[PDB]
RNA sequence: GCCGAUGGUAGUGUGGGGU
RNA sequence: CCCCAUGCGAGAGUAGGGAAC
């Protein structure tokens, strides 16, 4: 899934009277480039709402060009639920790394006998070309026996995506009942 | 658990203005 | 305190680097 938007640059143009303007400051880079520009909240707070970190957004730009990007950082005004500055990270020709979301899948032979399943992460950290961004990792959790835990390294990666973290990282596992992590009595 | 921008923000110097 | 103008500008985070592959 991609997405697209409108941005356009900046230089003088103060960020408060932008906001005020109905815009959302903020920039783009990557190893080569870096510019200050500004898009729609509107159209923003649309298009992320579906992308979020996870899908890339291609920004239509004045000069007629058109840049792939990925949200690295959205800037929430402290004291409220609104972005005041947000970051476009520019996919260029080398690997970036990114977080894709994990789909679990399955019920844990753990669960069967009482177990308590715990998915530790929603996302993973992963190292991967712009050209073969996955949309979701599956995880299968049905092996989880009772005391077990699947790793990163334990992930089935598709081909071309890789760990960005330590292979050890506990992506879930399955506790005992009779409480496992509080009991709400 | 190292170095570290730019951008934005907090804070702030000076001048002016204003609930 | 807020705004405008003008000069600085964190902390935290990101790019990039170091290290590693
Ligand atoms: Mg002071
Ligand atoms: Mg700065
Ligand atoms: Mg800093
Ligand atoms: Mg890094
Ligand atoms: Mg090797
Ligand atoms: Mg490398």
Do not use: C, W
């Not at 977080?99 to 006998?113: C, K």
């Not at 081909?159 to 009991?183: F, Q, R």
């Amino acid at each position: 899934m991609e997405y697209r938007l409108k941005a356009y640059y900046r230089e003088g143009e103060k960020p408060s009277a932008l906001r005020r303007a109905g815009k959302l400051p903020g920039l783009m880079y990557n190893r080569h480039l870096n510019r200050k520009v500004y898009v729609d909240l509107v159209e923003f707070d649309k298009v992320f709402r579906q992308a979020s970190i996870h899908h890339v957004i291609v920004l239509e730009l004045p000069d007629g060009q058109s840049l792939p990007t990925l949200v690295r950082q959205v800037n929430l005004d402290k004291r409220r639920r609104r972005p005041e500055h947000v970051d476009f990270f520019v996919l260029s020709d080398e690997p970036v790394e990114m977080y894709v979301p994990l789909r679990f899948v399955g019920t844990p032979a753990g669960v069967r006998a009482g177990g308590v399943l715990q998915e530790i992460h929603r996302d993973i950290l992963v190292k991967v070309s712009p050209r073969n961004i996955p949309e979701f990792i599956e995880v299968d959790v049905s092996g989880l026996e009772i005391g077990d835990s699947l790793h990163a390294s334990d992930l089935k990666l598709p081909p071309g995506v890789e760990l960005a973290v330590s292979p050890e990282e506990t992506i879930a596992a399955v506790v005992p009942p009779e409480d496992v992590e509080k009991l709400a009595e």
